[PDB]
Symmetry: C3
Subunit: 244 residues, 3 copies
């Protein structure tokens, strides 16, 4: 019914790793389109939204719509047995009791049957290196619980205040021709100034292994979106409402 | 009386490291033949058997038979002062109160006198990379307390079952010409299927630093033997009875 | 009033790192000459003495004498936001309430205002690799609380005794032409034999990141001095009285 092959297991390892600290139990929703996940975190503050599109697999088949009820601690114990370069295959039958995972290298075949659970179901956009976003959130987290994010045409300022004093980091808008991976770009219709939990943003930044660039999407009316491309139109997205 | 020189200290560092988690107090039995160790682990389940043959030293002299009563926590504190490439020399007199260790580089000489203690004294054979054996035992240990090992002419299957579901890893028999280090070989007189404690096998796999290949020797009547070559006919061997 | 620019932040990161385990609250005393620190450790046993000379900066300006009352846990939280190769600038006004730190790369500017506190104010010399000094102190610390340091024209012996037995490490005097970094040199007027706390010497050795050579200055009348050059005549010095 479901049969989905990744040429490399890396992507699914990294996704689950990026998410297991926020989400324990979730559903992997599989259809014609690919494999999606929508989950609030354990404290019901951050939204997690993932899509692996069918074109990300080679091949991808999902006859019928299948929700795979999965504990991500359980799932991590199985994916650790997968090497990054292992061919990974997911197999499932209709209303499955288990999900079947196979890892193929060196004439080695690993096969796991994971027991499934019953689980109930912008004003400014910043494109920058994900490592840089991770380093800033991590650094300011040592100083403050909260960070203020100011965007305008010219650059982005992350600012905070704590016991020991206060800190800012300012990244000016910059197209890097020789190394585009390093560019700071700011598509923006209106300057914005919004305050957020660093704890959640640092959790979001665990996903910097997936993409060397991150999209930070700011609105005065809807949650912050932090977004990592998984290839083509596949994505891992995090939503966090500003502190009001 | 005893005087034994290793051109490099690496081997003795790695041996003790491979063993200290199972054995605290043991005897290093020295004679004409070299330096042996036979010890049950602390829970009296696994047998440890080591031999460093006299030809492993340059030179080796042992006039009289000498049992060196040694705590391997104590001994580790001294061997950590030895660099891998240091010339290492053991010296002992008859019925010794101490063992004398010297480490020589860079015009540096380290000398230790360790206080000795009074210490009371196959159907199928698998040759494979030790790292691979370590990765499989480690991975299945996250899933299960026990692993079933099935050998036949064609390959080896390690299987297990736990809370989250069950897992298998299958390695087919394969002679690797370009990189022989990677080959899976199965000298076998009779297919065998035996269940063992993963906890002990993972402990045994600490020794994968000593040899890039490991020998897994299965019998329906005698304990499993896990075996690592230390050069020539020198060996570190582990014995573990199947779960019945 | 104070404005001091380091071409690289590395040195100030390493200094604070080398010191934070001994000293919590200290004064950075700034004048015409540069930036000094004198502090007993928390147990009032070891003296810490640092000088960054004005020529170490590019540029250095200190109109008026300024004591910067600083918690080094607080200061570490801010310096972690500085990359090793970041241009670092310290700014302060007269009787300052805060110290202003700026880190400049990649069109990135980080700026921190740290709240300041109200803080109340040889017979033989050994030149050797600092890594070697660190490896010996660390190794003997596993064995003993105390180390005896014997120097003479010919070499240096570090010796100790504990529960498990005793250990020595002997480094002979040696000029290394091809790699001078590795030489052992002993300017000496009188052989000396002195016993010291390993715990403190291992703390001192955290500073081996600053200099690949260390100066060990022994007197029968005044404290041991352990000394690391920070470039030119800039220094980090540690003083420790022998066990009597």
């Amino acid at each position: 019914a479901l049969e989905a092959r990744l040429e490399q297991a890396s992507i699914l390892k990294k996704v689950v790793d990026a998410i297991k600290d926020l989400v324990q139990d979730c559903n992997f929703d599989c259809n014609d389109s690919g494999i999606a996940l929508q989950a609030m975190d354990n404290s019901h503050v951050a939204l997690v939204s993932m899509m692996l599109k069918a074109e990300g697999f080679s091949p991808y088949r999902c006859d019928r719509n299948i929700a795979l009820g999965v504990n991500l601690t359980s799932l991590t114990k199985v994916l650790r047995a997968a090497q990054n370069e292992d061919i990974l295959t997911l197999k499932a039958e209709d209303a499955p009791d288990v999900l079947n995972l196979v890892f193929e290298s060196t004439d080695r075949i690993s096969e796991y049957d994971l027991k499934l659970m019953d689980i109930d179901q912008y004003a400014a956009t910043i494109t920058m290196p994900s490592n840089e976003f991770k380093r800033i959130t991590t650094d300011l987290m040592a100083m403050s619980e909260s960070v203020t994010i100011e965007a305008n045409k010219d650059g982005v300022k992350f600012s905070c205040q704590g016991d020991i004093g206060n800190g800012s980091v300012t990244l000016r808008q910059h197209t890097n021709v020789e190394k585009p991976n390093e560019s700071i770009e700011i598509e923006l219709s209106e300057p914005v100034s919004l305050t957020f939990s660093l704890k959640y943003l640092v959790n979001f930044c665990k996903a910097s292994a997936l993409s060397n660039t991150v999209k930070i999407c700011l609105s005065n009316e809807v949650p912050l979106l932090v977004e990592y491309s998984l290839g083509g139109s596949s994505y891992l997205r995090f939503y966090l409402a500003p502190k009001i």
